[PDB]
Tab-separated table of C-alpha atoms and ligand atoms in Angstrom:
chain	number	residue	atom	x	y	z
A	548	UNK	CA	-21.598	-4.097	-14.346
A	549	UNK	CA	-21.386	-0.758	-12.789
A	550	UNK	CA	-19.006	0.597	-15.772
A	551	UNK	CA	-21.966	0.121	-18.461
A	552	UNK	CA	-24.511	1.080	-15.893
A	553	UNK	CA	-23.383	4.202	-14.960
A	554	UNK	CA	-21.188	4.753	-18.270
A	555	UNK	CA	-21.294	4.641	-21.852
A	556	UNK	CA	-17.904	4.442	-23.622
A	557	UNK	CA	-17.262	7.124	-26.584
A	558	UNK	CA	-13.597	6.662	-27.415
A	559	UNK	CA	-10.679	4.179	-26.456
A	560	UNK	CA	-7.883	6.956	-26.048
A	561	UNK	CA	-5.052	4.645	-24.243
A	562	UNK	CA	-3.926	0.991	-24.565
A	563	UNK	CA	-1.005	-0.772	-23.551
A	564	UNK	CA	0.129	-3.335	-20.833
A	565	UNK	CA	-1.451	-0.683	-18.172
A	566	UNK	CA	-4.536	-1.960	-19.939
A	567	UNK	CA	-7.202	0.507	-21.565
A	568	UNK	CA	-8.663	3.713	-21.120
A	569	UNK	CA	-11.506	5.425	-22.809
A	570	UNK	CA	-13.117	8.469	-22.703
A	571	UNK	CA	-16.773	7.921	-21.248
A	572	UNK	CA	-19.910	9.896	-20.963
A	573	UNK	CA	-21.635	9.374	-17.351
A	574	UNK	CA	-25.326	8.596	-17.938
A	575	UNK	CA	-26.475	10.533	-14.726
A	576	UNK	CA	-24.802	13.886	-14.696
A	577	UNK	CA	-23.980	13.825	-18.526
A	578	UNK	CA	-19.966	14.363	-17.931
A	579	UNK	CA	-17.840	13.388	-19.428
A	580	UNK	CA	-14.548	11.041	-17.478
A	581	UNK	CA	-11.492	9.106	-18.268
A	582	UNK	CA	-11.754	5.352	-16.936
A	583	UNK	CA	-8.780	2.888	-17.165
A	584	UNK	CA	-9.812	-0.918	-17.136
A	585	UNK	CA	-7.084	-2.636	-16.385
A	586	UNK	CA	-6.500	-6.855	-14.991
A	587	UNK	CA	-5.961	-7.107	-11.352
A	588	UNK	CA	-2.119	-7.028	-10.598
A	589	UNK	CA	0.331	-9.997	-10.375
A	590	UNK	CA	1.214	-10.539	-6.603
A	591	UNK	CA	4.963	-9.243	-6.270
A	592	UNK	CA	4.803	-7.234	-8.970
A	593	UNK	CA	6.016	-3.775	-9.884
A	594	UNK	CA	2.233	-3.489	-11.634
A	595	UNK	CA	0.858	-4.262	-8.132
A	596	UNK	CA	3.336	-1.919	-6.151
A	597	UNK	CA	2.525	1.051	-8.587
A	598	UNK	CA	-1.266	0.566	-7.772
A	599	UNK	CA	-0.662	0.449	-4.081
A	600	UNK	CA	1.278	4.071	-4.660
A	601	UNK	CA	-1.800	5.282	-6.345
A	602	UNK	CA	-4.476	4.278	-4.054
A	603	UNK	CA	-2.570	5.868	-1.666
A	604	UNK	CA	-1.696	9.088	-3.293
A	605	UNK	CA	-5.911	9.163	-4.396
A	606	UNK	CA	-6.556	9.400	-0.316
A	607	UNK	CA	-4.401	11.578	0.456
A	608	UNK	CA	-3.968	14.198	-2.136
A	609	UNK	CA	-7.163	17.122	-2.668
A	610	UNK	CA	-8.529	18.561	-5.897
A	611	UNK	CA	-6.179	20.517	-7.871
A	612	UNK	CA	-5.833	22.806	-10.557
A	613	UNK	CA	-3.125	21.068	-11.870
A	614	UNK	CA	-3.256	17.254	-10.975
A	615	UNK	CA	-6.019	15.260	-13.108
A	616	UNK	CA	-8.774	14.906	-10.989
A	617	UNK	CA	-9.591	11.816	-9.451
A	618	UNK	CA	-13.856	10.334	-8.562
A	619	UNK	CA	-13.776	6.630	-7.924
A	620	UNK	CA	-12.324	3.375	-8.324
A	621	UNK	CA	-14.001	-0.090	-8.010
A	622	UNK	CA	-13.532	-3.780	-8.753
A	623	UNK	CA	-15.631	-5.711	-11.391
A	624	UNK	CA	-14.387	-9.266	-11.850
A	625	UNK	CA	-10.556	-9.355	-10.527
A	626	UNK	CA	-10.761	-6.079	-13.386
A	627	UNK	CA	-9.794	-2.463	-11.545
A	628	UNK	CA	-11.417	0.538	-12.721
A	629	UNK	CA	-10.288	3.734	-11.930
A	630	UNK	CA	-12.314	6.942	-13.012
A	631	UNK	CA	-10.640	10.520	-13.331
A	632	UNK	CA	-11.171	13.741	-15.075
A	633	UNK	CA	-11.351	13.914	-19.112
A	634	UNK	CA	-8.793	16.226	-19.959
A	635	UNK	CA	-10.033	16.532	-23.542
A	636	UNK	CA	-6.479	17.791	-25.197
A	637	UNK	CA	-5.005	14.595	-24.416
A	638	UNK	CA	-1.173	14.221	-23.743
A	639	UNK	CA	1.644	16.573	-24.083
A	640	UNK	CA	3.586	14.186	-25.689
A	641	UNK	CA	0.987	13.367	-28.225
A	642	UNK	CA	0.337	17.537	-28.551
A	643	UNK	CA	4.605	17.647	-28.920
A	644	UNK	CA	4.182	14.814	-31.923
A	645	UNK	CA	1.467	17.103	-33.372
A	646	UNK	CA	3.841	20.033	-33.229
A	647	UNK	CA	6.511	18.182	-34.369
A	648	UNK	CA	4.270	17.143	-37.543
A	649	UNK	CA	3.539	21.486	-37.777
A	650	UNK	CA	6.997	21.773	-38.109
A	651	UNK	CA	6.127	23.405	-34.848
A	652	UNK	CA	6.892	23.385	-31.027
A	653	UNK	CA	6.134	25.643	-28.054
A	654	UNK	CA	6.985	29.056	-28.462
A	655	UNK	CA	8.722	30.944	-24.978
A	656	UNK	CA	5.632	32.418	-23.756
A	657	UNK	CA	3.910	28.505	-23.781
A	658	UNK	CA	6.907	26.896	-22.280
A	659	UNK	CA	6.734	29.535	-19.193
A	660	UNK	CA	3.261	28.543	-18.749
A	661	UNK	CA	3.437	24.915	-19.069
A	662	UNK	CA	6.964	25.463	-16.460
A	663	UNK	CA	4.361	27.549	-13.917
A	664	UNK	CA	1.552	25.511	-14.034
A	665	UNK	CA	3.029	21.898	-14.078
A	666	UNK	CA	5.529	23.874	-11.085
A	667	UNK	CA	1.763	24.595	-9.408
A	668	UNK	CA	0.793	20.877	-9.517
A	669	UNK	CA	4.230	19.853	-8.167
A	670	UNK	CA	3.616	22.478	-5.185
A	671	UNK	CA	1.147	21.139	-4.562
A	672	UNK	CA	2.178	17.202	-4.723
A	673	UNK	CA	5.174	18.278	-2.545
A	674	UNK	CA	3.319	20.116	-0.038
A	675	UNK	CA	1.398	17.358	1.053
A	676	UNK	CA	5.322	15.734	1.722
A	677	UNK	CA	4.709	13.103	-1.202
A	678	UNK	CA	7.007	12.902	-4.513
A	679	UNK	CA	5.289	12.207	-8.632
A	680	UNK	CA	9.123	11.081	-9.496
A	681	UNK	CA	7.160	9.894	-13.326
A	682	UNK	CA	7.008	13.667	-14.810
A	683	UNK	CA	7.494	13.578	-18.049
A	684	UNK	CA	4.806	14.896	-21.193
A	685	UNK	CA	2.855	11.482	-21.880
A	686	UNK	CA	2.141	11.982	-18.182
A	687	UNK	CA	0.927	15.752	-18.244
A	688	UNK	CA	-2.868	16.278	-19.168
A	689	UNK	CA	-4.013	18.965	-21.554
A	690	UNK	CA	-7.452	20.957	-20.861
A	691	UNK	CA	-8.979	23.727	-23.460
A	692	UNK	CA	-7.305	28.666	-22.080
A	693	UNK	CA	-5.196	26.192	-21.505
A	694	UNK	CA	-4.518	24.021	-17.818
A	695	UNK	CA	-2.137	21.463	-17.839
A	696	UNK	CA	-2.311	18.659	-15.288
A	697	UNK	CA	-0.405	15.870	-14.068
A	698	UNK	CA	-1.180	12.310	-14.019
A	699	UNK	CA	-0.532	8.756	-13.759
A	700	UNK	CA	-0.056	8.726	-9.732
A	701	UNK	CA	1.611	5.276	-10.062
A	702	UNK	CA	4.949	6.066	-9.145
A	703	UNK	CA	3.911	8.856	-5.746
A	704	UNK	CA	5.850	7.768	-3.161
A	705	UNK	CA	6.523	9.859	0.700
A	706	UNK	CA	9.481	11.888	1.051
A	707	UNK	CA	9.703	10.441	4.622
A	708	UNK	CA	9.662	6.630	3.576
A	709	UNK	CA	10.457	6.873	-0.283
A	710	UNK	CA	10.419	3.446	-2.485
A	711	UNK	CA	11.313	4.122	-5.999
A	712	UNK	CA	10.163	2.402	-8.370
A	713	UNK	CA	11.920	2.385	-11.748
A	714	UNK	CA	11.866	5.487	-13.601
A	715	UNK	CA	11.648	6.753	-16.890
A	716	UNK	CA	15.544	6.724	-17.891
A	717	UNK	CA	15.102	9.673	-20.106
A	718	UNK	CA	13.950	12.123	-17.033
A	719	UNK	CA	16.145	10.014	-14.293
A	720	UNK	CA	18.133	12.510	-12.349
A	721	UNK	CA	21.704	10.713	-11.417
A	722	UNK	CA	21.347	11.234	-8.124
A	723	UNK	CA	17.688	8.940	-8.208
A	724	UNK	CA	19.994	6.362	-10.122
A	725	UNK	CA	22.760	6.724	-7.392
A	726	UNK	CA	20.187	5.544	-4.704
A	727	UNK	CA	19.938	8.393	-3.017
A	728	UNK	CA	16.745	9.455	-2.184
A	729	UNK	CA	17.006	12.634	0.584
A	730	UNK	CA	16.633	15.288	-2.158
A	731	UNK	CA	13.166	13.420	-4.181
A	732	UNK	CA	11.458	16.925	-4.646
A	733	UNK	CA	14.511	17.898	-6.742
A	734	UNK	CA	14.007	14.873	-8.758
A	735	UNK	CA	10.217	16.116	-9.874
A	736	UNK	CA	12.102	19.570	-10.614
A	737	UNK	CA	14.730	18.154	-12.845
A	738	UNK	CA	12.182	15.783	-14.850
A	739	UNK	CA	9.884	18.869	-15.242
A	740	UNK	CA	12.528	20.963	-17.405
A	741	UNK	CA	13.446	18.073	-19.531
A	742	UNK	CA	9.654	17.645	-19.626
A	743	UNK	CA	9.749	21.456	-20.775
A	744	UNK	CA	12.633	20.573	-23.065
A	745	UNK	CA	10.694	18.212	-24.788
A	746	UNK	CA	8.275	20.636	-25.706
A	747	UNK	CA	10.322	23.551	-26.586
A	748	UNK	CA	11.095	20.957	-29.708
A	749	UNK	CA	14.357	19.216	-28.306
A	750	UNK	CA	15.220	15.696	-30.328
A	751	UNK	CA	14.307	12.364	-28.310
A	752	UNK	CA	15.943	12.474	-25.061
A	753	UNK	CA	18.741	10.149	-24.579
A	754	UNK	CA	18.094	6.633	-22.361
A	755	UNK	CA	22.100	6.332	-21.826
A	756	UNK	CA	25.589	7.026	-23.218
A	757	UNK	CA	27.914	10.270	-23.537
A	758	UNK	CA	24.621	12.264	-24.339
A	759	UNK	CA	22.655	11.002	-20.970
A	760	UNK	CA	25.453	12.039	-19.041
A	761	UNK	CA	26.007	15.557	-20.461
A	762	UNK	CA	22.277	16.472	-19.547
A	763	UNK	CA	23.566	14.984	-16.024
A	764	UNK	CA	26.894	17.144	-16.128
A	765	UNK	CA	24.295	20.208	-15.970
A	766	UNK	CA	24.198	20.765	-20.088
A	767	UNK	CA	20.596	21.366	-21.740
A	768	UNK	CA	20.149	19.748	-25.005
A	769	UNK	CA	19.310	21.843	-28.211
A	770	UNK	CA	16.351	22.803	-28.755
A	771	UNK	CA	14.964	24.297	-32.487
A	772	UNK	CA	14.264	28.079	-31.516
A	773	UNK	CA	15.992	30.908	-29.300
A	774	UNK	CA	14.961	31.273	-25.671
A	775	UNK	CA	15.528	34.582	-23.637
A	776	UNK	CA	18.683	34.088	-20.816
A	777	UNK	CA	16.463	34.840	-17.676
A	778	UNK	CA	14.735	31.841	-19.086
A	779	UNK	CA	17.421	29.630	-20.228
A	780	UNK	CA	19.277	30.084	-16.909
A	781	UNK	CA	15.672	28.697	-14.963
A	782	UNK	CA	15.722	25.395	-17.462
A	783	UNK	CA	20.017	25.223	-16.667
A	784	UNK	CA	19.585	25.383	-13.007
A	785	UNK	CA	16.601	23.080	-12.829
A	786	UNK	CA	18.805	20.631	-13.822
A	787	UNK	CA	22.300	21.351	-11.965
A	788	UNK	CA	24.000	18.259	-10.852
A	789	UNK	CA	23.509	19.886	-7.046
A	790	UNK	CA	20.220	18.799	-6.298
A	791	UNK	CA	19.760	21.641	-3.280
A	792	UNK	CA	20.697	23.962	-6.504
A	793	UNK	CA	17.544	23.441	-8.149
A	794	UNK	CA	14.731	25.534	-6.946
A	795	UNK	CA	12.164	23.912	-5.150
A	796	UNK	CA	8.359	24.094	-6.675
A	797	UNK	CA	7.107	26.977	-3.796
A	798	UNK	CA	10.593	28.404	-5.580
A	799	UNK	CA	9.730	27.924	-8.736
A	800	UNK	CA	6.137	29.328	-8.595
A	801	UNK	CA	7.063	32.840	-7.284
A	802	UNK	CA	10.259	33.274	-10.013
A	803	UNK	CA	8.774	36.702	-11.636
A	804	UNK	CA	9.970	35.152	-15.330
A	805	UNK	CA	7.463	32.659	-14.932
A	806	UNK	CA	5.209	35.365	-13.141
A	807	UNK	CA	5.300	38.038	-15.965
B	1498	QT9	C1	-8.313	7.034	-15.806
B	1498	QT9	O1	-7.210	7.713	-16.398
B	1498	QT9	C2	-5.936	7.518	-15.914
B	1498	QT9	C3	-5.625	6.559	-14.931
B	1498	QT9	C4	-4.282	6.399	-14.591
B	1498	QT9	C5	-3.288	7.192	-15.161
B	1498	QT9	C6	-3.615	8.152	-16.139
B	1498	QT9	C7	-4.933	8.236	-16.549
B	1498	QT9	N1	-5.393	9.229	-17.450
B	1498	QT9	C8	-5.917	10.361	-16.973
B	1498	QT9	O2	-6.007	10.615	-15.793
B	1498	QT9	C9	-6.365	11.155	-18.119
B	1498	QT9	C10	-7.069	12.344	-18.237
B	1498	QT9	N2	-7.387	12.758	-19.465
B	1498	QT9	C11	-7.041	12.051	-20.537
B	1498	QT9	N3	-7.374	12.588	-21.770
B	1498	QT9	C12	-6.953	12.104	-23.022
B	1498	QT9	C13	-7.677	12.614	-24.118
B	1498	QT9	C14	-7.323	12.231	-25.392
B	1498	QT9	C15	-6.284	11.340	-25.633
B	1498	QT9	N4	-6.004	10.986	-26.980
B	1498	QT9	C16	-7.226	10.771	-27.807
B	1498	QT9	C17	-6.843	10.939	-29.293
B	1498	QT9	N5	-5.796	9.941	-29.611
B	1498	QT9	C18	-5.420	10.029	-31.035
B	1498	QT9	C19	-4.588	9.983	-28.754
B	1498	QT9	C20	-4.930	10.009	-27.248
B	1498	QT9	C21	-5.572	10.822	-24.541
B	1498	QT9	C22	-5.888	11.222	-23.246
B	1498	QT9	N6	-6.407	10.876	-20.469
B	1498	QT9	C23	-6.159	10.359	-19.264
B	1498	QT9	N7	-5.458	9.253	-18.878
B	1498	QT9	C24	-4.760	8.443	-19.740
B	1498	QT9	C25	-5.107	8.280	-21.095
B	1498	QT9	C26	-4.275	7.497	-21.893
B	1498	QT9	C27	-3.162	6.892	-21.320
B	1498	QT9	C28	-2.896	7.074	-19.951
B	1498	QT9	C29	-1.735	6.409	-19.235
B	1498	QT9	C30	-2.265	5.429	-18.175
B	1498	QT9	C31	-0.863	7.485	-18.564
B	1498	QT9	O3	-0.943	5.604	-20.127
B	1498	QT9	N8	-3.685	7.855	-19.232
């Protein structure tokens, strides 16, 4: 098996139906690497069409800053294995449930920086004319300084040819749910300040109802502390109902809030 040849597991830090990942050491140059184990996907599935849109995206995207590195991925016994960066802080959903648990929550200064550099990764993603259309914080990586990075390229599709899978409902911009796909960039931009919403302490996100549809009408949900205006107004029009409203990433990267 080249997974306990060249690996030794140290920690199982995902499961679900996407399968496993742990947190290995690799024997020869003593790093240490995430590696999901997963079962080979179901013909016609939306398992096998997500891991067609990350093969893909792991050809054609470089390294990063701020997208989770990825190294190799092999076959072993109709099992895939995909090996990326450690990011050793884990989630920042699971670091917003340890907050939470603080009584705590990103403070201004952390949001900004988690805004810029997640805005840096989607530059980047959108540069290379390809969509993430899956941010949200159990899919944005944690390193310790502090990088954040995103993940979970299962959902990149091209802005040229776009299939969209289904999406998170909680980070769904209505136009994505209307079926119309020629502003996708925009979609990565709204999901990004809800992402930030999330963890500048905001309650769960709505899936549906009159609440889904407010954050839809352009209205940000509460969130437990004060934020300045110049950076309540970025998080407001990231999320206008005018998807040519909402500032692009290049946009977003050179706003002088974020900047400062
Ligand atoms: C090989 O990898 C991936 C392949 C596909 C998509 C995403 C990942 N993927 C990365 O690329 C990544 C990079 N770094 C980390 N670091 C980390 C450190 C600690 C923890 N903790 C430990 C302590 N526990 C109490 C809680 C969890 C969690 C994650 N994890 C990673 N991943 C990852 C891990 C779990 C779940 C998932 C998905 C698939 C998204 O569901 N992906």
């Amino acid at each position: 098996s080249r997974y306990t040849t060249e690996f030794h597991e140290l920690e199982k830090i995902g499961s679900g139906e996407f399968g496993s990942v742990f947190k290995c050491v690799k024997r020869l140059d003593g790093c240490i690497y995430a590696i999901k184990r997963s079962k080979k996907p179901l013909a016609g599935s939306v398992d096998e069409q997500n891991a067609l849109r990350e093969v893909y995206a792991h050809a054609v995207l470089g390294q990063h800053s701020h997208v989770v590195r990825y190294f190799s991925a092999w076959a072993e016994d109709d099992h895939m294995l995909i090996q990326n960066e450690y990011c050793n802080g884990g989630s920042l959903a699971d670091a917003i449930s340890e907050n939470y648990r603080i009584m705590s929550y990103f403070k201004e200064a952390e949001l900004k920086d988690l805004l810029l550099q997640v805005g840096r990764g989607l530059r980047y993603i959108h540069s290379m004319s390809l969509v993430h259309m899956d941010i949200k914080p159990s899919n944005i990586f944690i390193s310790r300084k502090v990088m954040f990075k995103i993940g979970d390229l299962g959902h990149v599709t091209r802005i040229s040819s776009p299939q969209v899978e289904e999406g998170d409902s909680r980070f769904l911009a209505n136009e994505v749910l209307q079926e119309n796909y020629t502003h996708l960039p925009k979609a990565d931009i709204f999901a990004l300040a809800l992402t930030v919403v999330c963890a500048a302490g905001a309650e769960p996100l709505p899936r549906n109802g009159d609440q889904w549809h407010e954050i839809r009408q352009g209205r940000l949900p509460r969130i437990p502390q004060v934020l300045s205006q110049e950076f309540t107004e970025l998080l407001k029009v990231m999320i206008h109902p005018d998807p040519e409203r909402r500032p692009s990433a290049m946009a977003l990267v050179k706003h002088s809030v974020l900047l400062s």
